[PDB]
Write a protein that binds this ligand. Structure first.
Ligand code: SLS
Length: 209
């Protein structure tokens, strides 16, 4: 059973801007997703200090980067706090509305797209390089869900029947045809070293084949 939702108009406008604006420095998408993963890992780690059972779904706190040239996907996996169905449908878009407005005014005042993370909407930088984004997520308090959007104003949510994750978030970037450089090991290593060198969780870059 697949549910289809409309983005809020302001979020649809942000995604169109990200997709349509000429902006060569696309590699910052990875910094934003890794930073999002680090934030999610901070949250479950802090919650586990007063409720150790919150780690019954997985003790390991890490980030995995998985390229797949056959599928042309780059997957960012973390074992963070995960995301509820209400997060996917309502809560994140509510917070994103005010950050999008602030980001919009900042851009007209001279800011650039690489500053997107300062406004809490860095996730949408994924559409700098991805024609479609699939998000698999599991929060301790909810079921495992699959969120998906190719932009165009709508997204879907379904219960995920795939491999159980235990806890966390998997962001699957279906890359645009001219953005396959982000499947190369040397390119990903360069970006992580440049932008994410002090993340306080192990980042493992998987090797292809
Ligand atoms: N607004 C945000 O910062 C955000 C983050 C993650 C995320 C979404 C939105 C949409 C659902 C899938 O995952």
């Amino acid at each position: 059973e697949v549910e289809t939702f409309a983005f809020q108009a302001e979020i649809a406008q942000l995604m169109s801007l990200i997709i349509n604006t000429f902006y060569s420095n696309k590699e910052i998408f990875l910094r934003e997703l890794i930073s999002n993963s680090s934030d999610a890992l901070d949250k479950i780690r802090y919650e586990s200090l007063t409720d150790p059972s919150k780690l019954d779904s997985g003790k390991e706190l890490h980030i995995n980067l998985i390229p797949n040239k056959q599928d042309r996907t780059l997957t960012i996996v973390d074992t963070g706090i995960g995301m509820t169905k209400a997060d996917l449908i309502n809560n994140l878009g509510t917070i994103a509305k005010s950050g999008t407005k602030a980001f919009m005014e900042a851009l007209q005042a001279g800011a650039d797209i690489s500053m997107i993370g300062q406004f809490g909407v860095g996730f949408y930088s994924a559409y700098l390089v991805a024609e479609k984004v699939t998000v698999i997520t599991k929060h301790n308090d909810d079921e495992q869900y699959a969120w998906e959007s190719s932009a165009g104003g709508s997204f879907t949510v379904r219960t995920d029947t795939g491999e159980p994750m235990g806890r966390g978030t998997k962001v699957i970037l279906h890359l645009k045809e001219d953005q396959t450089e982000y499947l190369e090991e040397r390119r990903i290593k360069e970006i992580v070293k440049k932008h994410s060198q002090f993340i306080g969780y192990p980042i493992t870059l998987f090797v292809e084949k």
